[PDB]
């Protein structure tokens, strides 16, 4: 039994993914020795960077032996020329095969793309030779978007990518308990959504940082979950890692959940996050 439990944990941790901002290239260089070659590393898209900064980060990811995944924030783009400015820049520096497309955090779109589907269905990703497009998933819903609109958006984006012959994957918002993603993942399989799913996990970080992100992201923080994950603001430790969620995922994930990997959000710093992964695997004997 210990042997089979270790094997299931080793499979779940195979091909885990990471992310950086354009400000984190030095951290990536320091972390690289213990990051598996080929690891998918996102470059998130948020205000406060130039396209050149994002392209340089993606280039370094590739040079270090990893697979860059530029994020595209639809609502931050003014028009097709704006998007092509970034895509042309990326195509010139990386093997542009993976992107991740989201509506973006603006409350009001800045341009011609209302949401991720508007960008995806425009055809532009196919023009640039993209073979993999990731999309969001929200097992606990979203503060601004109804469950029904989230599900329809997922179905419409999957349908658009299928029509264009572009493979897709899903990356979920993190949670502080495994129950929402376990239920939600089986449900999307039932609706015929069979693409690979990367279950998002919050990396080890200060409890205050985790709770601030969770409030902004609409992540559940019921009393029972806060106690189980260890998120008390009077905690003697002051930080929390994702082991409570991993401990439910590894035994309960099954064939009914389909193709599943893990994604780590480095809320506490990329080096700290990957060191946690290395040390967790070591303590579990994998
Ligand atoms: C894994 C992951 C990575 C992310 N990375 C980034 C990132 O790099 N940069 C970033 O800015 N954000 C990022 N986000 C956040 C995401 O942009 C926001 O959650 C956004 O509010 C919704 O984007 P979406 O792609 O899920 O929405 P979509 O699937 O595009 O939209 C879902 C539905 O809601 C509508 N809609 C979209 N936005 C709103 C709104 N604000 N109010 C009401 N209806 C709306 C759409 O028209 C559509 O009908 C990420 C989220 C996830 C889960």
Curated annotation (Swiss-Prot):
GO cellular component: cytosol
Pathways involved: One-carbon metabolism; tetrahydrofolate interconversion; Amino-acid biosynthesis; L-methionine biosynthesis via de novo pathway
Cofactor (UniProt): FAD
Any Gene Ontology biological process: methionine biosynthetic process
Residues that, per the record, bind (6S)-5-methyl-5,6,7,8-tetrahydrofolate: 105, 173
Catalyzed reactions per annotation: (6S)-5-methyl-5,6,7,8-tetrahydrofolate + NAD(+) = (6R)-5,10-methylene-5,6,7,8-tetrahydrofolate + NADH + H(+)
Record bears the keyword Manganese: no
Top-level class of the enzyme under EC nomenclature: oxidoreductase
Assigned keywords, A-Z: FAD, Flavoprotein, NAD, Oxidoreductase
SUPFAM superfamilies documented for this protein: FAD-linked oxidoreductase
Binding site for NADH: 173
Enzyme Commission numbers on file: 1.5.1.54
GO terms assigned for molecular function: FAD binding; methylenetetrahydrofolate reductase (NADH) activity
Effect of deleting the gene: Mutant cannot grow on vanillate or syringate as the sole source of carbon. Mutant retains vanillate and syringate O-demethylation activity, but accumulates methyl-tetrahydrofolate as a result of the THF-dependent O-demethylation of those compounds.
Binding-site residues for FAD, renumbered to this chain: 49, 71, 104-105, 116, 138, 142, 157
Function, in words: Catalyzes the NADH-dependent reduction of 5,10-methylenetetrahydrofolate to 5-methyltetrahydrofolate. Is required to provide the methyl group necessary for methionine synthetase to convert homocysteine to methionine; the methyl group is given by 5-methyltetrahydrofolate. Is required for Sphingobium SYK-6 to grow on vanillate or syringate as the sole source of carbon.
Family recorded in the similarity comment: Belongs to the methylenetetrahydrofolate reductase family.
Protein name as catalogued: 5,10-methylenetetrahydrofolate reductase
Taxonomic source organism: Sphingobium sp. (strain NBRC 103272 / SYK-6)
Organism taxonomic ancestry: Bacteria, Pseudomonadati, Pseudomonadota, Alphaproteobacteria, Sphingomonadales
Protein's gene: metF
């Amino acid at each position: 039994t210990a042997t089979l439990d270790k094997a299931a944990l080793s499979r779940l941790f195979t091909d885990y993914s990471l992310e950086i901002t354009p400000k984190d290239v030095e951290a990536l260089e320091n972390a690289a020795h213990m990051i598996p070659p080929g690891t998918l590393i996102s470059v998130t898209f948020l205000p406060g960077a130039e396209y050149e900064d994002r392209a340089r980060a993606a280039k370094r990811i590739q040079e270090l032996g990893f697979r860059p995944v530029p994020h595209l924030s639809a609502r931050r783009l003014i028009d097709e020329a704006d998007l092509r400015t970034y895509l042309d820049m990326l195509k010139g520096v990386i093997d542009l095969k993976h992107v991740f497309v989201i509506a973006g955090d603006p409350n009001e779109p800045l341009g011609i793309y209302e949401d991720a589907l508007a960008l995806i269905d425009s055809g532009i990703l196919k023009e640039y030779g993209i073979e993999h497009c990731g999309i969001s998933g929200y097992p606990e819903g979203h503060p601004d978007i109804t469950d029904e609109k989230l599900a329809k958006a997922m179905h419409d984006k999957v349908a658009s990518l299928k029509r264009q012959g572009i493979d897709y994957s899903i990356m979920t918002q993190f949670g502080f308990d495994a129950e929402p993603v376990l239920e939600w993942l089986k449900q999307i399989r039932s609706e015929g959504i069979d693409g690979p799913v990367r279950i998002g996990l919050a990396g080890p970080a200060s409890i205050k940082t985790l709770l601030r992100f969770a409030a902004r992201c609409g992540v559940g923080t019921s009393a029972k979950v806060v106690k189980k994950y260890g998120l008390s603001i009077t905690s003697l430790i002051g930080s929390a890692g994702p082991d409570p969620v991993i401990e439910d995922l590894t035994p309960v994930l099954g064939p009914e959940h389909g193709q599943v990997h893990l994604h780590f959000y480095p809320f506490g710093g990329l080096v700290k996050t990957n060191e946690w992964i290395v040390n967790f695997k070591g303590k579990q004997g994998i």
